[PDB]
Amino acid sequence: KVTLADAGFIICAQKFNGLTVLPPLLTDEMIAQ
Amino acid sequence: PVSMTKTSVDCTMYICGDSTECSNLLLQYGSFCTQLNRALTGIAVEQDK
Amino acid sequence: PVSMTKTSVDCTMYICGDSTECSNLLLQYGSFCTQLNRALTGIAVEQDK
Amino acid sequence: VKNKCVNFNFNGLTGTGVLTESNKKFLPFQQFGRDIADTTDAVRDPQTLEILDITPCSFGGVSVITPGTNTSNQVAVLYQDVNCTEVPVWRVYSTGSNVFQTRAGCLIGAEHVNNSYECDIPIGAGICASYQT
Amino acid sequence: VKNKCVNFNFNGLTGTGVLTESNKKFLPFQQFGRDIADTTDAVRDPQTL
Amino acid sequence: ALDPLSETKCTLKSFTVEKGIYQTSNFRVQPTESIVRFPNITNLCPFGE
Amino acid sequence: QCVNLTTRTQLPPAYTNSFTRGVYYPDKVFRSSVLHSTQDLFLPFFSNVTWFHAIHKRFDNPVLPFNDGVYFASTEKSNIIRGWIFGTTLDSKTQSLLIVNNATNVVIKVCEFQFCNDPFLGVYYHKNNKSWMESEFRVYSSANNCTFEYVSQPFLMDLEGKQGNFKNLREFVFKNIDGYFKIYSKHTPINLVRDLPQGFSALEPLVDLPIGINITRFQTLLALSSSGWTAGAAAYYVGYLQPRTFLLKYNENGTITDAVDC
Amino acid sequence: LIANQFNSAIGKIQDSLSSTPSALGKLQDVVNQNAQALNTLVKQLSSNFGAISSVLNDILSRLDPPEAEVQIDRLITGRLQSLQTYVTQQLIRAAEIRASANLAATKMSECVLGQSKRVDFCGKGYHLMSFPQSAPHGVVFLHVT
Amino acid sequence: FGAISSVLNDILSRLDPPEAEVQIDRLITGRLQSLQTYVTQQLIRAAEI
Ligand SMILES: *[C@@H]1O[C@H](CO)[C@@H](O)[C@H](O)[C@H]1NC(C)=O
């Protein structure tokens, strides 16, 4: 049910001017663990 | 909710890309980009915390 | 305490109070007034919540 | 030229980036192409009718990993967000003894092991680095 | 004329608004009247005092 | 400009650095050559007449 | 030579609702599935527009003002409207723009003319050879000082045709900014009696001209001895542009699909 | 009987989430807000700010270094001010999220790991227990009461 | 704010537009930054409440 609002604006996704998004330290899977 | 998405901004490439004279104009403004990166670094640490 | 009084400040009528050239010269500054109105309306909704 | 980061001028439109043959279907009068960000990413070549995708060539920040200077003087480097097939663009830690690929990017200066312990220095994606025998 | 949104021009001092009769008891050396925000709100007509 | 460890000493302004991760020295691939493109223009001015 | 035509039916002017017509690409940047807002000169939705028609008894060709671009639409059969005049005074006190869609050529020029009271072009009606030969070209009295001309490739077009419903829906909009004439247009097959349809249609950019003159008034030109005539039915509609602010939506292939007045 | 009521309630929970699409809104808008914040950041790049152009190259390719510092100074001031606004908003929002996360951790430590007697802390009614479920950027408690 | 006056209409009553813009830039800067201060302080107080 959860979807992001804009596609490409939350693997090659580097923004054109200096915007980066850091992956979380804990991934999806071990939280479920 | 628990956390937002961590994000980070490179100050100089945000302000002006490729223009070294813009960098010369920027470097008289002190150390603002250090403050900016420091604040975003603190937020990004607190997310995982 | 529970809430405060909900306030609203119109950006253009505050700054360029009934001037046409002032609105035009304001137009080059991006989208500040939208951001200010959005923040204030969010506050005012939050009070009733 | 193609497949390299170059700086370009297409008919008064200057920029920098790597160019790619594209699949976008222009209308015949259309010249530029933009984003939702209103940033140019699609340019029609004036000489020959084709659509060129513009990608800004890569970049990133440098992460540096160390124990304390009371402990050691050996460090490791993370190039974030880069499949590090083009790493070297100091230089001495550009080809040193291994490269390791993570979801964060390229790790150089640490050797990947199999065992799993508790986290020491949080790098990311469940991956942590430490100093041991 | 009174009681309309009009343009007005008193002694070069111009503006837009509605003019009405006051009861402010001036002293003869005074001409204008000001507000907190340094806006004109009481004007002596030059032709008829 | 010598080594990453020295880069940390240079940007943290200390001769001692404790254990962890730090962020320095944002980079760019720095493009190679220039290029210009223009239409195949053929309508000359008849100077021979 | 140019004569005054008088024999007609007299009627008051008519207005028609321009429902949602007259949208054009503001630039040449391609978008895909994008809601983008602009602000520019546009024809407002749901205005009333001037409706003129040549029937049977009608030759309705006056001089109209040109301010901030105009939108011109025509429902026609067999291409009776041929020309456009532009200029401040049309009488060699100011420069004059001449656009002609000849049966042979299209002629585009600017010189210093003196146009007549009723300039027009006259074609005969089935003169024993099943061809309508164009015989009369009564536009200006002279061409004093010339500054720029152009003529395209010659061609042939049909000067004959009778239909119960007009097939040609030709849509144009003309703008003048900083010495530049902008002609933006669209052609459409259509089946309607005496009206303009409801629907969406963008205008592709077609022509820019770097002319550099002041333009105030204009008039179009019609196809048809000095009295006595035979013209087919045609109709056109004239609307004016106002500076407005719109929202436009682009599909995946990048055509403007629908528009929103603010 | 309790087993039947429990299983029926769980099935109704699945049906209630699969039916109503407006349930996860408390998670969603935060993400949306961050997105549009980043979005409007990009939109401040293309302002004039009283300078002649928003293209830095075109100012450089037309105006001379005796005077171009005046225009690029304006560009510096405008873009720096936009960064100020963006990160001040981010700091306030992050403090708010931290407060909500502390509330979440308290709820996890008391409602799940034990049985609290605080009325209406762990949902409506007399609290029996809780089960947690993971969610994108969040947690979902199922209180059994 | 360093300009001739704080009255918007008086500057337009006296100056040509190529200098009215010079003054009104400084005025719009001062007023805008004041409004920025106000909205930030309001956000902090709303979070406290
Ligand atoms: C437009 O003209 C028609 C002509 O009949 C008239 O009925 C209508 O009221 C007019 N609308 C406006 C907005 O002027």
Side-chain angles (χ1 to χ4, degrees):
Chain A
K1 292 295 284 295
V2 174
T3 48
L4 75 165
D6 195 11
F9 303 71
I10 319 178
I11 302 295
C12 309
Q14 40 187 6
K15 297 292 185 185
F16 63 92
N17 292 323
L19 306 177
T20 48
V21 272
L22 293 323
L25 170 66
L26 283 188
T27 62
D28 204 315
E29 206 62 33
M30 61 285 278
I31 299 172
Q33 286 207 246
Chain B
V2 165
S3 71
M4 61 195 48
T5 56
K6 321 155 72 171
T7 186
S8 71
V9 169
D10 191 11
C11 185
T12 64
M13 294 298 103
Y14 177 72
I15 283 175
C16 48
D18 294 330
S19 166
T20 184
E21 59 273 26
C22 176
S23 299
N24 296 115
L25 265 295
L26 183 58
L27 263 295
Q28 73 179 4
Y29 273 71
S31 60
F32 271 112
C33 302
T34 297
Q35 311 310 86
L36 270 284
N37 296 337
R38 177 188 290 96
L40 276 296
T41 295
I43 300 166
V45 164
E46 284 187 353
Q47 301 312 293
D48 171 72
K49 176 175 172 61
Chain C
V2 167
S3 67
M4 65 184 73
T5 78
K6 316 154 62 180
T7 174
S8 278
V9 185
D10 183 26
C11 190
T12 316
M13 184 177 177
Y14 181 78
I15 299 177
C16 302
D18 275 357
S19 179
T20 316
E21 303 93 331
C22 197
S23 66
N24 302 320
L25 284 185
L26 172 66
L27 266 186
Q28 286 86 16
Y29 271 69
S31 66
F32 282 94
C33 300
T34 64
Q35 296 185 235
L36 306 170
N37 297 336
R38 185 165 63 213
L40 268 298
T41 296
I43 295 170
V45 169
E46 183 267 354
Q47 298 303 304
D48 286 351
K49 199 197 59 51
Chain D
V1 305
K2 289 180 181 179
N3 300 78
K4 336 178 185 174
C5 193
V6 295
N7 62 6
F8 46 84
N9 192 2
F10 277 72
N11 305 323
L13 198 71
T14 74
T16 187
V18 61
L19 318 164
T20 304
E21 181 36 50
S22 199
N23 61 315
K24 310 183 172 194
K25 304 297 292 297
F26 269 33
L27 279 74
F29 56 89
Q30 294 177 319
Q31 312 303 113
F32 291 166
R34 264 170 204 268
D35 208 18
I36 189 64
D38 291 331
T39 56
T40 82
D41 55 341
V43 171
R44 168 179 273 183
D45 190 11
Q47 290 183 205
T48 187
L49 318 172
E50 60 188 0
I51 311 302
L52 299 165
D53 196 1
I54 294 177
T55 301
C57 46
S58 291
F59 64 101
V62 175
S63 299
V64 288
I65 308 154
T66 179
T69 46
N70 200 6
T71 298
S72 281
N73 300 287
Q74 183 178 0
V75 294
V77 56
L78 168 67
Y79 294 83
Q80 55 192 9
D81 292 331
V82 169
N83 197 332
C84 53
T85 57
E86 54 278 12
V87 65
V89 75
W90 34 261
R91 204 262 305 165
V92 60
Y93 298 96
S94 285
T95 52
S97 175
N98 51 355
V99 306
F100 184 62
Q101 187 72 45
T102 74
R103 308 268 323 280
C106 202
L107 200 59
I108 287 160
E111 175 199 358
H112 186 220
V113 309
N114 296 312
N115 288 321
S116 58
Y117 320 129
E118 60 86 20
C119 184
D120 199 0
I121 298 170
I123 301 299
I127 308 302
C128 297
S130 178
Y131 189 80
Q132 264 187 13
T133 302
Chain E
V1 302
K2 302 181 192 173
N3 302 93
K4 284 291 186 290
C5 286
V6 297
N7 277 273
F8 53 86
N9 197 334
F10 295 89
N11 287 354
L13 192 147
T14 176
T16 66
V18 61
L19 302 177
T20 181
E21 176 61 34
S22 63
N23 67 341
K24 293 192 176 195
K25 293 188 286 184
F26 269 36
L27 276 80
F29 51 90
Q30 296 149 352
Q31 175 157 56
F32 292 128
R34 275 210 196 281
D35 210 4
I36 313 295
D38 178 8
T39 55
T40 59
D41 47 336
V43 175
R44 156 169 287 165
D45 165 61
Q47 288 186 172
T48 58
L49 312 173
Chain F
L2 183 63
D3 61 84
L5 174 57
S6 302
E7 190 144 25
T8 59
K9 330 296 304 193
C10 179
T11 186
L12 277 296
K13 298 204 45 153
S14 177
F15 286 161
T16 176
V17 169
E18 59 98 22
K19 172 200 208 178
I21 183 169
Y22 305 91
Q23 180 177 3
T24 68
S25 199
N26 307 318
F27 79 106
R28 194 194 215 139
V29 176
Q30 204 64 38
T32 63
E33 76 209 347
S34 301
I35 183 175
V36 68
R37 299 292 275 180
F38 274 124
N40 200 356
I41 190 167
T42 70
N43 49 1
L44 277 296
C45 298
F47 289 157
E49 316 310 315
Chain G
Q1 188 264 326
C2 49
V3 288
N4 314 269
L5 271 298
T6 315
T7 177
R8 273 169 312 277
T9 301
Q10 280 311 89
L11 285 150
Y15 298 151
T16 312
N17 192 30
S18 52
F19 301 99
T20 46
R21 295 294 179 187
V23 298
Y24 59 95
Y25 291 89
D27 62 358
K28 289 170 173 310
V29 184
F30 161 80
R31 292 186 177 85
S32 71
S33 286
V34 167
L35 289 96
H36 178 231
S37 67
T38 60
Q39 164 200 348
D40 201 78
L41 269 290
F42 287 102
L43 172 62
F45 291 164
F46 295 98
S47 165
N48 46 24
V49 298
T50 312
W51 172 22
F52 287 156
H53 47 70
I55 188 56
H56 185 214
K57 290 184 285 185
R58 280 323 303 253
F59 293 143
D60 61 357
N61 288 139
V63 177
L64 282 72
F66 186 94
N67 47 340
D68 307 67
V70 301
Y71 160 80
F72 190 98
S74 296
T75 187
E76 288 180 358
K77 189 52 215 189
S78 67
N79 304 52
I80 310 303
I81 289 294
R82 301 297 179 92
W84 291 270
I85 311 149
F86 296 89
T88 310
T89 179
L90 266 67
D91 219 351
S92 280
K93 270 80 72 181
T94 311
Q95 304 212 54
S96 301
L97 279 163
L98 185 149
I99 315 296
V100 167
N101 194 327
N102 195 3
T104 73
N105 302 113
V106 292
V107 185
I108 297 89
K109 78 179 77 164
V110 54
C111 300
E112 195 174 2
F113 309 92
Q114 305 95 298
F115 307 102
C116 302
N117 279 29
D118 210 326
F120 77 109
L121 265 69
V123 64
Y124 289 150
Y125 56 105
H126 189 74
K127 209 63 69 163
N128 293 115
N129 52 1
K130 212 190 293 181
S131 158
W132 285 42
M133 61 305 297
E134 177 81 45
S135 176
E136 277 201 313
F137 182 92
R138 327 291 164 183
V139 184
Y140 47 87
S141 64
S142 177
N144 293 138
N145 187 26
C146 286
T147 46
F148 177 70
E149 290 83 2
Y150 162 79
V151 55
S152 199
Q153 191 73 249
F155 47 83
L156 60 93
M157 65 182 179
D158 204 350
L159 321 169
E160 196 267 345
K162 294 203 45 155
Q163 293 268 24
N165 267 339
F166 299 144
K167 201 58 61 164
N168 286 318
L169 187 41
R170 299 183 161 205
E171 303 210 315
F172 304 88
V173 60
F174 321 118
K175 317 198 293 168
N176 264 316
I177 192 66
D178 56 54
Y180 281 81
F181 205 95
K182 295 180 176 292
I183 294 183
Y184 293 161
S185 180
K186 166 86 167 191
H187 182 278
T188 303
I190 202 61
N191 200 324
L192 190 41
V193 288
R194 218 177 65 243
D195 307 298
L196 59 89
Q198 294 182 355
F200 200 84
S201 277
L203 260 59
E204 309 97 357
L206 189 59
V207 168
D208 189 5
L209 306 176
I211 301 309
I213 62 175
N214 305 277
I215 295 296
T216 300
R217 288 188 298 212
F218 66 101
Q219 178 171 189
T220 183
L221 297 174
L222 196 71
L224 177 135
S225 192
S226 74
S227 313
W229 41 259
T230 297
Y236 63 94
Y237 303 81
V238 168
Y240 285 73
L241 311 183
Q242 295 160 44
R244 287 292 207 70
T245 294
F246 283 172
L247 187 68
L248 311 178
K249 73 179 195 76
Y250 297 87
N251 70 325
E252 61 271 14
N253 267 325
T255 177
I256 290 181
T257 297
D258 202 356
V260 162
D261 189 8
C262 301
Chain H
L1 175 78
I2 297 169
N4 294 346
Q5 293 196 23
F6 187 81
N7 300 346
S8 312
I10 292 300
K12 288 183 286 184
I13 282 299
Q14 277 186 350
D15 291 330
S16 175
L17 276 296
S18 66
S19 86
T20 313
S22 163
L24 298 101
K26 277 74 69 177
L27 295 180
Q28 179 78 54
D29 52 350
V30 164
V31 174
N32 288 358
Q33 272 163 10
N34 274 2
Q36 63 84 30
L38 270 296
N39 198 0
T40 195
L41 191 60
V42 184
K43 183 62 65 68
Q44 291 294 135
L45 273 299
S46 84
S47 295
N48 290 318
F49 286 110
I52 309 169
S53 199
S54 49
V55 185
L56 188 64
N57 275 318
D58 201 3
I59 313 180
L60 293 169
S61 302
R62 192 177 61 248
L63 277 301
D64 291 331
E67 72 266 14
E69 69 275 16
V70 187
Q71 315 295 318
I72 63 187
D73 189 291
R74 299 179 147 270
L75 277 191
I76 294 298
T77 285
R79 294 174 174 187
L80 199 63
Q81 187 77 297
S82 283
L83 285 176
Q84 292 313 60
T85 304
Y86 166 69
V87 304
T88 313
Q89 293 255 8
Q90 283 286 113
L91 279 168
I92 299 173
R93 289 163 50 85
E96 192 269 335
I97 284 286
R98 189 219 313 116
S100 199
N102 273 339
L103 181 59
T106 305
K107 289 222 182 197
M108 173 83 53
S109 295
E110 304 201 5
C111 300
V112 176
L113 258 55
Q115 182 187 23
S116 190
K117 307 295 305 303
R118 307 162 51 176
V119 181
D120 213 37
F121 189 66
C122 307
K124 199 168 170 305
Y126 292 113
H127 178 226
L128 278 178
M129 64 183 72
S130 295
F131 311 114
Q133 299 289 280
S134 195
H137 298 332
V139 75
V140 169
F141 291 98
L142 316 172
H143 295 296
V144 184
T145 52
Chain I
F1 285 103
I4 287 179
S5 174
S6 54
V7 175
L8 171 57
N9 294 290
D10 280 16
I11 306 177
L12 267 74
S13 83
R14 290 174 293 169
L15 274 297
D16 280 331
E19 297 83 0
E21 56 91 9
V22 173
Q23 306 278 276
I24 204 62
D25 195 0
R26 294 179 66 189
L27 281 172
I28 201 167
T29 296
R31 288 184 168 170
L32 187 63
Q33 198 270 334
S34 288
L35 196 66
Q36 203 55 170
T37 285
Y38 167 70
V39 63
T40 294
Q41 217 283 334
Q42 277 292 129
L43 276 176
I44 300 309
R45 283 214 181 109
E48 167 175 11
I49 297 286

mmCIF file of all heavy atoms in Angstrom, chain G residues 15 46-48, ligand 1:
data_model
loop_
_atom_site.group_PDB
_atom_site.id
_atom_site.type_symbol
_atom_site.label_atom_id
_atom_site.label_comp_id
_atom_site.label_asym_id
_atom_site.label_seq_id
_atom_site.Cartn_x
_atom_site.Cartn_y
_atom_site.Cartn_z
ATOM 1 N N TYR G 15 -21.628 36.716 -32.527
ATOM 2 C CA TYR G 15 -20.619 36.201 -31.620
ATOM 3 C C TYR G 15 -20.872 34.719 -31.385
ATOM 4 O O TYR G 15 -22.015 34.254 -31.430
ATOM 5 C CB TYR G 15 -20.634 36.945 -30.281
ATOM 6 C CG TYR G 15 -20.318 38.423 -30.365
ATOM 7 C CD1 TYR G 15 -20.850 39.316 -29.442
ATOM 8 C CD2 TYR G 15 -19.503 38.929 -31.368
ATOM 9 C CE1 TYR G 15 -20.577 40.664 -29.506
ATOM 10 C CE2 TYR G 15 -19.222 40.279 -31.443
ATOM 11 C CZ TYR G 15 -19.762 41.141 -30.508
ATOM 12 O OH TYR G 15 -19.487 42.486 -30.576
ATOM 13 N N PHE G 46 -14.012 30.152 -23.036
ATOM 14 C CA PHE G 46 -15.427 30.506 -22.932
ATOM 15 C C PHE G 46 -15.656 32.003 -23.092
ATOM 16 O O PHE G 46 -16.487 32.606 -22.415
ATOM 17 C CB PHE G 46 -16.022 29.975 -21.633
ATOM 18 C CG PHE G 46 -16.029 28.490 -21.570
ATOM 19 C CD1 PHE G 46 -15.032 27.819 -20.891
ATOM 20 C CD2 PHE G 46 -17.009 27.760 -22.213
ATOM 21 C CE1 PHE G 46 -15.015 26.445 -20.840
ATOM 22 C CE2 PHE G 46 -17.001 26.382 -22.170
ATOM 23 C CZ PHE G 46 -16.003 25.723 -21.481
ATOM 24 N N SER G 47 -14.903 32.607 -23.998
ATOM 25 C CA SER G 47 -15.201 33.960 -24.423
ATOM 26 C C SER G 47 -16.101 33.923 -25.646
ATOM 27 O O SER G 47 -16.358 32.871 -26.228
ATOM 28 C CB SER G 47 -13.925 34.726 -24.738
ATOM 29 O OG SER G 47 -14.236 35.894 -25.474
ATOM 30 N N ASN G 48 -16.584 35.089 -26.044
ATOM 31 C CA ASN G 48 -17.334 35.211 -27.282
ATOM 32 C C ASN G 48 -16.402 35.783 -28.339
ATOM 33 O O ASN G 48 -15.551 36.626 -28.039
ATOM 34 C CB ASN G 48 -18.603 36.048 -27.106
ATOM 35 C CG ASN G 48 -18.385 37.347 -26.330
ATOM 36 O OD1 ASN G 48 -17.287 37.885 -26.270
ATOM 37 N ND2 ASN G 48 -19.451 37.856 -25.721
HETATM 38 C C1 LIG J 1 -20.777 37.287 -25.699
HETATM 39 O O1 LIG J 1 -21.598 37.641 -26.834
HETATM 40 C C2 LIG J 1 -22.889 37.007 -26.842
HETATM 41 C C3 LIG J 1 -23.576 37.418 -28.122
HETATM 42 O O2 LIG J 1 -24.916 36.946 -28.169
HETATM 43 C C4 LIG J 1 -23.672 37.411 -25.594
HETATM 44 O O3 LIG J 1 -24.913 36.717 -25.579
HETATM 45 C C5 LIG J 1 -22.876 37.078 -24.340
HETATM 46 O O4 LIG J 1 -23.559 37.567 -23.192
HETATM 47 C C6 LIG J 1 -21.482 37.698 -24.405
HETATM 48 N N1 LIG J 1 -20.699 37.317 -23.242
HETATM 49 C C7 LIG J 1 -19.876 38.157 -22.607
HETATM 50 C C8 LIG J 1 -19.146 37.595 -21.424
HETATM 51 O O5 LIG J 1 -19.719 39.316 -22.979
#
